[PDB]
């Protein structure tokens, strides 16, 4: 089967991309209103415009949810999903066709994360406008007042004391110096894993980097799972509902998921269990709950 597959995939893909264009444009306009507070305005439009790929990266999970709701809602409300089942096309096959549309967004999410977001973020910071006081390598504590990616007032303490050496101009590497100030969330996966591997070889990786690693490796799986939940709602609770009601509910699931993943991200930094449990928690449960609503047909 190909003609049916193209119709379901193209209709959902245009709805996922159409929602993506709208959601980014609204967030650029809304963010532009806010920055204007700390104002030149043009110097403030480029800073928001350069942040669009990063606003785009954080919309893909929620644009895929709304896209599958509106993409399949148009098919469902037109009684087109009933006549695909009437000929022998299962619910899990129609979900598989929608996942193909979401797989374009997952690949787009990788491209933004790896090559686009880390570049436009740096260009954004410049518009608004090299680590200082950098503070452990096993049993040695190293403090450098100025560090450059290409040192000033070095101080290394060995451990019972052996030597407190000081200089004016050890496992520190200039490649990861520019990643020290960057938040663990903002680091790309290529940068994050390389930095974590560097820290783990000489010290302990903080739990804020473990959470950032798990929040990135489970980003494609949260986009697909949130699409499957959207598809199961169309065949289940949101069947025969209005297009406006489906869009409203798709917004509540998007916020509910964004708040749940934000809160459980914070809860992983305050509680003993590994961040994998908190990050892969909702994703596994929504997949199980979403796949159950599909079993109920």
């Amino acid at each position: 089967r190909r003609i049916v597959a193209k119709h379901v995939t193209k209709t959902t893909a245009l709805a996922m991309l159409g929602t993506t264009i709208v959601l980014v444009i609204l967030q650029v306009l809304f963010t532009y209103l806010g920055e204007l507070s700390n104002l030149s305005a043009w110097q403030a439009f480029l800073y928001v415009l350069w942040g669009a790929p990063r606003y785009l990266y954080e919309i893909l999970p929620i644009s895929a949810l709304i896209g599958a709701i509106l993409g399949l809602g148009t098919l469902a409300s037109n009684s087109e999903l009933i006549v695909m089942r009437s000929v022998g096309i299962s619910l899990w096959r129609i979900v598989g066709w929608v996942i193909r549309s979401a797989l374009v967004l997952v690949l787009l999410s990788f491209a933004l994360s790896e090559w686009v977001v880390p570049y436009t973020n740096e260009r954004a910071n410049s518009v608004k406008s090299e680590v200082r006081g950098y503070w452990r390598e096993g049993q040695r504590f190293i403090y450098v007042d100025y560090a450059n990616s290409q040192l000033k007032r070095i101080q290394v303490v060995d451990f019972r004391l052996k030597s407190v050496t000081n200089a004016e101009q050890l496992a520190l590497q200039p490649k990861y110096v520019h990643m020290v100030t960057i938040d663990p969330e903002d680091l790309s996966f290529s940068q994050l894993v390389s930095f974590m591997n560097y820290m783990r070889e000489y010290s302990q990786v903080p739990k804020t980097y473990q959470l950032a690693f798990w929040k990135k490796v489970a980003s494609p799986f949260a986009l697909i799972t949130l699409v499957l939940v959207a598809c199961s709602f169309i065949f289940g609770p949101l069947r025969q509902q209005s297009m406006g009601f489906r869009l409203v509910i798709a917004l509540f699931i998007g916020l509910g998921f964004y708040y749940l993943q934000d809160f459980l991200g914070y809860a992983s930094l305050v509680y003993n269990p590994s961040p994998a449990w908190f990050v892969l928690g909702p994703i596994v449960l929504m997949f199980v709950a979403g796949s159950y609503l599909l079993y109920r047909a």
Partner: protein, 289 residues
């Protein structure tokens, strides 16, 4: 009977929307506050008091928004399930139905007038004292596991941390004294009375006008929800929500953009009713087209 029918419906679905927006608008801020508390920059036991003191601040916006959304859901339901065709077909227009809710909108105006004039400053006054008390935290209060925290002349590294911010492990302290241990245990809030007569100053001219002409967005949320509620039965009860929440939000965004241009002594306090009157007249004209 038709007025009591509508008031019961609007109050019931406005309180649901208001409680739904409070859970969302301040659920997002509570989670964000929890994010600050997870890093030690805010006491985890007080972040529920911050939400308590910001109730009047958020409900200042949610109440016009809840009334506006609750008005269109009710008027959308009358259109969707054909109760408006039999109300218009009996001689009761949609404008007449919106005029039956003026006594209700006046109650919501009085309620928000209490929020804007009294509890929004009072809530922000106690929050400002409380938030400033959390900005003095320094030293071992801001410590994080497996990280170096520098606060002035102090550098603290803790190898582990409990679920509560006590009982540190593998502690390194630097000034020069080095210590290593295994274990270690605003006009927005000023009471209205002050801004009551202290006008002729952009600061109060912007704030006091924001508190006096601010509550009248409930009336504008009444005659603009009546205008933008006509929806077809097949279109849905929620079809005209997102298009018309942005029309309402364009009023608030304009009113926030007026509060600032008065604070900079650029526009004058007269522009608060003018912003409402333009939206009031536009809504009245659209409801009578």
């Amino acid at each position: 009977i038709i007025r009591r029918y509508l008031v019961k419906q609007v109050v019931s679905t406005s309180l649901v929307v208001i409680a739904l927006l409070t859970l969302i608008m301040m659920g997002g801020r509570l989670i964000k506050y929890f994010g600050v508390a997870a890093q030690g920059r805010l006491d985890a036991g007080v972040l529920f008091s911050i939400i308590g003191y910001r109730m009047p601040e958020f409900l200042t916006l949610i109440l016009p928004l809840g009334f506006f959304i609750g008005l269109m859901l009710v008027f959308g339901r009358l259109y969707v399930d054909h109760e408006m065709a039999v109300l218009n077909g009996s001689g009761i227009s949609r404008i007449r139905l919106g005029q039956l809710l003026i006594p209700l909108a006046l109650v919501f105006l009085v309620i928000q007038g209490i929020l804007m004039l009294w509890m929004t400053p009072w809530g922000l006054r106690q929050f400002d004292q409380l938030s400033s008390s959390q900005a003095v935290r320094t030293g071992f209060d801001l410590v994080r596991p497996k990280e170096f925290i520098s606060s002035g002349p102090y550098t603290i590294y803790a190898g582990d941390l409990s679920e509560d911010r006590k009982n540190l492990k593998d502690i390194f302290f630097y000034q020069d004294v080095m210590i290593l241990a295994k274990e270690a245990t605003k006009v927005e809030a000023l009471p209205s009375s002050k801004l009551w007569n202290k006008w002729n100053d952009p600061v109060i001219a912007s704030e006091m006008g924001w508190r006096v002409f601010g509550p009248f967005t409930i009336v504008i949320a009444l005659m603009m929800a009546v205008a933008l509620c006509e929806v077809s039965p097949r279109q849905g009860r929620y079809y005209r929500l997102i298009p018309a929440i942005f029309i309402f939000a364009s009023l608030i965004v304009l009113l926030i953009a007026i509060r600032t241009r008065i604070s900079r002594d650029e526009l004058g306090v007269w522009a608060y009713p003018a912003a409402l009157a333009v939206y009031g007249i536009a809504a009245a004209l659209f409801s009578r087209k």
